[model samples]
Target: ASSVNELENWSKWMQPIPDSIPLARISIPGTHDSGTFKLQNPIKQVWGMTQEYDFRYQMDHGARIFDIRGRLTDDNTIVLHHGPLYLYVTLHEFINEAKQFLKDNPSETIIMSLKKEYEDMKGAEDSFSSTFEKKYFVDPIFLKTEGNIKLGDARGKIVLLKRYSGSNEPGGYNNFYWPDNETFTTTVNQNANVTVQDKYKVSYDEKVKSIKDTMDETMNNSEDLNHLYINFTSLSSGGTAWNSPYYYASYINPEIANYIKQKNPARVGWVIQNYINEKWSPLLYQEVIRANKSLI
Candidate 1:
């Protein structure tokens, strides 16, 4: 009934554990705009988006990102957490490529043309996919989650990313017509592939000030900003099952995989089928053992 690590708490992830590192930024790529939640979206995490109503009507909802979490006991090592040790680097590059494509094409005008062209075109070349869209999602993945690393040390590292079960957590609208058991996949215009990635200048010891700044709220100050770290919390398989090779593995880009294979192999573990803490109690332990059992 218990997992190997014996995770005590599932609902609350401590600072430096979840909030202190790059985990937040990586996991929560875009709060508003393209990757944002819809106004009619059943599970609206953030609040007050005037445009959300309009976006909702466009047959678009929230962006589906995968979430992964890393955990470290010491608050100082918060610097190390990002999307996930295995996938953060990959995430950075993908976001950059998305930004450049938007910079060059400039989709802003397409919105204006929709009034007349909507009948003939049936669809635009792309959705709200643009630089601002890519940058917002990418910036936080690396900066905000890696809260204040100075305050915590390395007990462990935790990172949570995004996954799209149609759009974020379960329930509500899942607009995309993906496969029954489909994994997240994106189109690659330049590479003629499904995904792309870009490398970051900052590596292991290179501290980006933005990461530090985003983590400021989680200081050892009198106020409490919750845990320094947050694991990728998921109702689906406890978050260990969600996989996007595009963001982590080079299943799509073998060349890139070969390049970073040894340098940063991106070997990540899933919370997949991992036992949730609450499920470990004696009462549920017996109940879960029956056929067709799950936290859901």
Candidate 2:
């Protein structure tokens, strides 16, 4: 990873958004947005094998324009974006702290005196640990959903290490997990015909051949759009990761299925979600395009 004193560096991977173009505009049919934004909001997520915690607090909804956090560059503006593994590590410490707390205080009796303290800190548990539906932690490494980029020999089977630059430990619970985001309005299930649409477009030189060449180029373009939408601080440097090339592994695959057996059902479920989103919903993909273009 980019070795920087995180303890002293409060703004390594995040930013405050006064930097790039302001206002993200959207106007899907039923939704509101007639070419005017009452001020758009931003969405964010940190990477890890386990769920999120204090170090990484994400509202279930988008953050308001004013809520953006970061430092101004030479232009005197700020905005924060992706930190993949770094954020994951921060959350890792957070959940670990909570889990440690839970383990430290074991209760055998129904104590009433501790009610207040428990209540105050109990809420922390949900943030530190995983909710019943989501995984205990966010999984850093992940398999991509079934898609074209899986063009390489490992197509649809690449592993994403939140440790985009850390040590590798098997079953170590990197820090957070994805997909296991049981986003149902009721809080348990949320997969239905929500009527979401996604769109992606790009210009190709055609000078590229070999499946890898074409795929890499196309993937880069796709990532560019992601950056346009995500527009995180880390991306301004140019070398920013253009795309998230996830792998595609199915429960039907013995190797992947067995790996999950070694891990757990939740981890497996998270992986499946990645696949479904790629295969089905176009919500995420849509955001990428809307962010990239200046729609009329």
Tens digits of per-residue lDDT for model 1, 130-246: 221233333432212222222122112211222222222221111222233222234212211111111122221121222222223222211222221111111111112323211
- What shift in Å separates residue 135 of candidate 1 from its native position after superposition? 6.6
Per-model TM-score on C-alpha atoms: 0.19, 0.16
lDDT, candidate 1, equals: 0.20
Give the Å shift of residue 48 in candidate 2.
22
TM-score of 2: 0.16
Off-target runs (Cα >4 Å) in candidate 2 are: 1-57, 61-90, 93-163, 166-229, 233-296
lDDT of 2 by residue, 111-214 (tens): 00000001112223332112211342233222222111111222112122121112233221122222221221111112111111111111111111121232
Q: Candidate 1: which stretches are off by over 4 Å?
A: 1-7, 13-122, 125-132, 138-268, 273-296
lDDT of 2: 0.19
Per candidate, the number of residue pairs that clash is 61, 42
Give all candidates' CA lDDT scores: 0.20, 0.19
